[PDB]
Amino acid sequence: PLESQYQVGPLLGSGGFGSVYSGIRVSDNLPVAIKHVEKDRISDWGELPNGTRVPMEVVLLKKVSSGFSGVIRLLDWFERPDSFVLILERPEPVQDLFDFITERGALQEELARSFFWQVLEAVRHCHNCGVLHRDIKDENILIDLNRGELKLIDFGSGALLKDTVYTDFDGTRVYSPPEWIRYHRYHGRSAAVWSLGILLYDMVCGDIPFEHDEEIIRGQVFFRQRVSSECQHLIRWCLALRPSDRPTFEEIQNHPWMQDVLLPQETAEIHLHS
Numbered sequence: 014p015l016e017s018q019y020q021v022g023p024l025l026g027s028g029g030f031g032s033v034y035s036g037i038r039v040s041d042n043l044p045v046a047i048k049h050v051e052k053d054r055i056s057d058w059g060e061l062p063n064g065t066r067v068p069m070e071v072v073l074l075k076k077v078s079s080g081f082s083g084v085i086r087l088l089d090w091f092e093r094p095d096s097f098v099l100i101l102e103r104p105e106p107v108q109d110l111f112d113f114i115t116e117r118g119a120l121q122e123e124l125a126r127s128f129f130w131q132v133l134e135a136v137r138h139c140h141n142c143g144v145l146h147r148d149i150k151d152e153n154i155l156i157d158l159n160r161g162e163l164k165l166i167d168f169g170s171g172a173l174l175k176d177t178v179y180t181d182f183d184g185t186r187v188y189s190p191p192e193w194i195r196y197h198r199y200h201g202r203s204a205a206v207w208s209l210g211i212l213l214y215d216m217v218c219g220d221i222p223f224e225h226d227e228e229i230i231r232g233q234v235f236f237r238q239r240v241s242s243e244c245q246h247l248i249r250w251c252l253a254l255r256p257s258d259r260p261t262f263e264e265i266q267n268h269p270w271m272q273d274v275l276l277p278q279e280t281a282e283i284h285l286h287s
């Protein structure tokens with residue numbers, strides 16, 4: 014019974030993902046996020062071992078549930094006549110990466126390296142659990158400000174990870190690869206690497222590199238801020254036009270720019286004021 018279990022606070026945000034409210038679990042005063050998604054707005058539907066029909070987002074979240082703090086944890090969910098309600102963990106204080114970059118501008122490379130590394134660990138965890146996120150971007154990354162820890166949110170555009178071709182997509186166009194733009198065809202990991210290149214450019218430059226299809230297709234990267242040669246190299250590698258020319262996750266984390274990463278707590282202390 015959702016009403017007696019949770020105390021609802023103010024709206025945190027709304028959009029393609031639904032409507033998300035601040036909340037508190039009444040039993041232990043635990044901070045939570047209460048996310049409502051209309052059934053009519055749900056694109057595709059998933060399984061669950063017991064065989065009840067839930068949104069794919071519920072399927073994906075349960076598959077990535079663990080002690081690992083790099084991905085948002087699904088605590089509970091309810092079905093209503095016209096909607097599903099998802100109870101998610103809530104770090105406090107928290108800020109999404111989009112608001113963070115909007116406020117601070119382009120990030121120092123040490124900060125970007127720490128953030129980007131944690132994103133890579135989170136995305137590797139998802140793939141490991143058979144989940145493809147499909148909407149990696151600044152707005153879908155939360156910063157636990159006290160701990161310096163990032164969390165992937167909004168799995169509502171995701172899919173079970175497969176090795177065959179995807180011919181469907183409903184994530185964010187400006188983070189989508191040229192093979193999707195040109196052919197409506199992409200493979201999971203190499204498309205994820207593309208979005209990671211877009212994200213990394215966004216962190217160090219303070220905005221995304223491409224706005225229009227023609228720019229995505231052309232793949233020419235211009236740096237508008239001063240960015241180190243090693244960071245530029247990594248970005249341009251992730252944003253290779255041919256999917257098979259893109260780095261693996263392993264090649265990204267072994268890249269010279271990625272070495273000597275700060276611990277999350279170190280990151281909080283130096284860059285988040287902690």
Ligand SMILES: OCc1nc2ccccc2[nH]1
Pocket residue numbers: 025026030033045046048085101102103104107155166167
């Ligand atoms: O899907 C938007 C969303 N905002 C959140 C805030 C805290 C925790 C989880 C959240 N999910």
Ligand SMILES: [Cl-]
Pocket residue numbers: 048085101166167168
């Ligand atoms: Cl979420």
